[PDB]
Write a protein that binds this DNA or RNA. Structure first.
Ligand SMILES: [Zn+2]
Ligand SMILES: [Zn+2]
Lengths: 576, 394
DNA sequence: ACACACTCTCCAATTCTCTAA
DNA sequence: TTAGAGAATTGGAGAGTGTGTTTTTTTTTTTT
């Protein structure tokens, strides 16, 4: 084996002499600068990069990659020995734990207690990432790189590093460094005075003196497309500690550098985990309307309705007499009609959204669920956005009541263990439904065709029947497009809706009077020709205010009401 | 000599600290007449409550130094403030009789930390947080002073106990026989404790995530002041404890469990008779009282009168109370009207005829999720006895 | 590997006895 | 009269030994 003293001096030489042609080629010696910041307590963790080491000594890099734990300890001791040379300044007292250390120094006048920094390796660029299936037992103890998806994360917990006790009789203190996942505490004083006199003094543990570190537990899983044919995906446990905590999130793609090790017992076969050293994450109105689903011919005003669904209205909030701004709409489709393309286009387009289907498949439902913590739910995962329901007509009573509760309160409840937990569901709803049998029949009402109950079905601001039928030129055009596809700016739109949705336009009393006259005349025609109700008025308000938000204007105007009126009026024509 | 005492691990003098708190009591007048807390001291002397609240903002505005020491070392500072208050309370009014020493409860007016941002740096500091209550335990008794009696000769002795450890006698001092002293459980002295579970409130969550939770322990006076579902602001000491690997073995795990040690928490006439008499003597009072119901509804006056008459009712054989039915299309304002009148009467109840309803009309028997013993669950109709019960989708 | 219950041993503290200060 | 040395009996400090330790298929009554 190597002489680790010689290796220590080599590591010191690297820290003392290396410059990356750094600070725009001024050769300011990056690690020397870092040691100054560390000495003056400006910074806690230090990521040493193995590509830098490779410039001087590739054999050292190879030495590190196998049995990495030795070199972790070695580099940490080297940094502690060199730190006073880069100090020039006295640091202000800022921590109770360090106030105890200061008192200890004042009274005196192990190193692990004082070592307030963290040292980690950034993997060499030679090492391509392995999949969770290729980290076999020949890699125990070696530095590895892995790629996958996060599934679960715990809260941050305090992990014990060194314990500090005080003695009732002799007034001394004792220390106990911790390394294994468990330990056994001290009881009676080992100091010479107490021992020689057998005076029996007891030891009291001090949470004001002992040292703790931030600790968090995580799980990571294989990508589905990487799994070989006819197999179930696997998972690996990752332990996060120190300044690496709170980076990762559930459902997020990550690449992790770490050491692969076996778990300590308390048989010859043992479980393993990955010790993390670094975590890396992987006019305007007509133009925007024409930008929605250009693959689909016609349906000009339906695209504008979906645009305003994405833009939204305003929450009025007059002292609890609430009117909400979220638009909600529903599409009734004939069998096999083009609605799937439009639906998926809005799903793809929207910056925050989710999709589900009403049949109640083997996966998790519309609401959250429990496993052995709470998780999931399409209604939950779309929150500051829009959620889309497919084949709505096949929903169950549980689904209908869940949608009803979301429409009223925009929140849900699921019982973890009998406790009445409750959970945010702030999103807008988009529904897709199909008639009970065959094509829609114009001789019968929409309730008779689609057969959802009228109470919740009438919640939607707009209802559209997507009916279509053969024609030679249109079918030929469609076939030409599909066969052509088989043979051979969203950023601006997102920024536009980002800036324009800052507006919350009001209405003046003149517009309220105008709306009053228009609404009563509309209801007169509605009963003379009924479906009209207060919901209709609030829908008009929502769509007109949404259009006012689409403009860069601080108030609604006559044209906004007129546009909303023709949109709600003409929607009936789709049913006939 | 008390002046020699200094808190361990630091350099703060105890006696000086006590003096500074007494100066605060003797000086702090309300900035918006004797000092503000001296008014409460005069009042509590006759009212007979055992506790004194103090707002931290008054301490800070009076002195930055004392405030910093309080937040840093609550375990040693708070008992000192207790002693200060009791000295003033008995130096004044010496003939007053009180069963217990006064407790002081410092409290901070508003939340300082999110319960997602508590860190190992906070341990044993005084913090304040806010959330929604989920569950409350049964009351737990807790030992304070053990009573030992000799089996051989009936001699007795008492043992003050040390952070959970009892110093059991080895030999009876009267009769010199070893292993003859027995603990008498029901002669020992006990205290009350309760365990409370709390959750972050839905407003301050990151989007689409599930909520976090914490465990609170409340002692003596505070032991029964909250119920599930409501919302509170709490001030306490953030503690941390090791846990054992198994009930037999003495090894402990290397990752600790933390909880809040509660100190204070806050929830978020002849003149009236004469006004009522004059108002009742005014003409058209029946119309006026009916008109007052549901201002969102502009025309249904006789329906409002019927509801008013139901609220007033008859008087006591025959059923003296009144029953009313509302019929017609769905989507009409009747459900809003039910919810309005439900909120007007103390013994009120509200539920739906649908099976999805939150509480049933029928009484039933079930196993307790905590103890798994049987409990009898009476329905909404029983709970609303001598009250109004609103039913929807009837 | 880490805790009760039981059995057993050797070292030296307490008292009797004879002696000197 | 007061105190120390040599011999005999006994307590207990200490060591050694033995033992324990949610998630799927099928039936039956009564609700529909
Ligand atoms: Zn000691
Ligand atoms: Zn006795």
């Amino acid at each position: 084996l190597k002489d680790y003293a010689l290796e220590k001096e080599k590591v010191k030489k690297f820290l003392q002499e290396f410059y990356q042609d750094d600070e725009l080629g001024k050769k300011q010696f990056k690690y020397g600068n870092q040691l100054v910041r560390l000495a003056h307590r400006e910074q806690v963790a230090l990521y040493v990069d193995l590509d830098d080491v490779a410039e001087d000594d590739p054999e050292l890099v190879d030495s590190i990659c196998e049995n990495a734990r030795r070199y972790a300890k070695l580099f940490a001791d080297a940094v502690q020995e060199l730190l006073p040379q880069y100090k020039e300044r006295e640091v202000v007292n800022k921590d109770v734990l360090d106030v105890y250390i200061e008192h200890r120094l004042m009274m005196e006048q192990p190193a692990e207690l004082m070592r307030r920094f963290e040292l980690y390796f950034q993997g060499p660029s030679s090492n391509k990432p392995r999949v969770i299936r290729e980290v076999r037992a020949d890699s125990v103890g070696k530095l590895v790189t892995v790629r996958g998806i996060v599934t679960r994360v715990s809260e941050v917990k305090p992990k014990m590093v060194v314990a500090t006790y005080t003695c009732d009789q002799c007034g001394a203190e004792t220390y106990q460094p911790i390394q294994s996942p468990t330990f056994m505490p001290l009881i009676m004083c080992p100091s010479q005075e107490c021992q020689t006199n057998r005076s029996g003094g007891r030891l009291y543990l001090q949470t004001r003196g002992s040292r703790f570190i931030k600790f968090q537990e995580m799980k990571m899983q294989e990508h589905s497309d990487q799994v070989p044919v006819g197999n179930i995906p696997r998972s690996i446990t990752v332990l996060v500690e120190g300044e690496n905590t709170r980076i990762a999130q559930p459902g997020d793609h990550v690449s992790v550098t770490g050491i692969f090790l076996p778990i300590l017992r308390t048989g010859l076969l043992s479980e393993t985990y990955l010790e993390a050293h670094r975590i890396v994450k992987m006019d305007f109105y007509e133009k925007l309307a024409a930008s929605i689903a250009p693959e689909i011919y016609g349906h000009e005003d339906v695209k504008k309705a979906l645009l305003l669904l994405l833009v939204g209205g305003v929450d009025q909030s007059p002292r609890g007499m609430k009117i909400r701004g979220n638009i909600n709409i529903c599409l009734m489709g004939d069998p096999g009609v083009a609605k799937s393309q439009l639906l998926s286009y809005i799903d793809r387009l929207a910056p925050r959204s989710q999709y589900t289907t009403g049949r109640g498949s083997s996966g998790v439902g519309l609401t959250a669920a429990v496993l052995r913590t709470l998780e999931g739910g399409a209604l939950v995962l779309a929150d500051q956005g829009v959620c889309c329901i497919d084949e709505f007509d096949k929903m169950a009573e549980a689904d209908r009541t869940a949608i009803h509760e979301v429409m009223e309160q925009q929140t849900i409840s699921i019982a973890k263990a009998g406790i009445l937990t409750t959970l945010n569901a702030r999103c807008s709803i988009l529904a897709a439904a199909n008639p009970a049998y065959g094509r829609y029949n114009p001789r019968r009402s929409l309730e008779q065709n689609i057969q959802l109950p009228a109470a919740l079905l009438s919640r939607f601001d707009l209802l559209w029947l997507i009916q279509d039928r053969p024609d030679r030129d249109n079918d030929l055009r469609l076939a030409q497009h599909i066969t052509y596809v088989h043979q051979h700016d969203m950023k601006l739109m997102r920024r536009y809706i980002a800036m324009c949705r800052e507006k919350q336009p009001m209405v003046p009393e003149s517009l309220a009077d105008y709306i009053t006259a228009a609404y009563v005349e509309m209801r007169r025609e509605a009963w003379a020709s009924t479906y009209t109700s207060a919901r209709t008025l609030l829908a008009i308000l929502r769509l007109s205010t949404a259009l006012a938000r689409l403009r860069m204007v601080d108030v609604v105007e006559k044209e906004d009401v007129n546009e909303a009126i023709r949109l709600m009026e003409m929607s009936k024509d789709s049913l006939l | 000599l008390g002046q020699k005492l200094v808190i361990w691990g630091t350099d703060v003098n105890v006696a000086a600290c006590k003096e500074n708190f007494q100066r605060f009591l003797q000086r702090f007048i309300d900035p918006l007449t004797e000092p503000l807390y001296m008014q409460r001291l005069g009042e509590i002397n006759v009212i007979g409550e055992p506790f004194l609240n103090v707002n931290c903002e008054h301490i800070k505005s009076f002195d930055k130094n004392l405030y910093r020491q309080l937040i840093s070392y609550p375990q040693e500072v708070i008992p000192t403030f207790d002693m200060a208050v009791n000295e003033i309370f008995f130096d004044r009014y010496p003939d007053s009789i009180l069963e217990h020493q006064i407790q002081v409860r410092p409290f901070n007016a508003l939340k300082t930390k999110n319960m997602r941002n508590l860190n190992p740096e906070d341990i044993d500091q005084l913090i304040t947080i806010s959330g929604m209550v989920i569950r409350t335990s049964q009351l737990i008794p807790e030992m304070q002073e053990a009573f030992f009696q000799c089996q051989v000769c009936a001699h007795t002795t008492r043992v003050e106990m040390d952070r959970g450890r009892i110093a059991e006698p080895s030999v009876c001092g009267r009769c010199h026989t070893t292993h003859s002293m027995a603990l008498i459980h029901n002669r020992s002295l006990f205290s009350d404790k309760q365990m409370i579970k709390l959750q972050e409130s839905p407003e301050d969550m990151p989007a689409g995530q599930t909520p976090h939770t914490v465990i609170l322990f409340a002692h003596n006076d505070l032991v029964d002041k909250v119920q599930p579902g409501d919302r509170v602001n709490v001030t306490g000491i953030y503690r941390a404890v090791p846990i054992r690997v198994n009930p037999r073995v003495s090894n402990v795990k290397s990752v600790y469990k933390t909880h809040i040690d509660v100190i204070h928490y806050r929830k978020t006439s002849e003149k009236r008779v004469e006004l009522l008499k004059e108002l009742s003597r005014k003409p058209d009072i029946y119309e006026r009282l009916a008109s007052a119901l549901a201002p969102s509804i502009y025309e249904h006056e006789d329906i409002k009168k019927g509801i008013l008459l139901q609220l007033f009712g008859g008087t006591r054989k025959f059923r003296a109370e009144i029953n009313i039915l509302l019929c017609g299309d769905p989507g009409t304002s009747k459900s809003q009207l039910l919810q309005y009148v439900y909120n007007l009467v103390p013994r009120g109840q509200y539920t739906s005829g649908k099976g999805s309803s939150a509480v049933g009309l029928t009484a039933y028997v079930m196993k307790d999720p905590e103890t798994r013993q049987l409990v009898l669950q009476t329905g909404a109709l029983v709970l609303s006895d001598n009250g109004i019960c609103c039913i929807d989708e009837f």
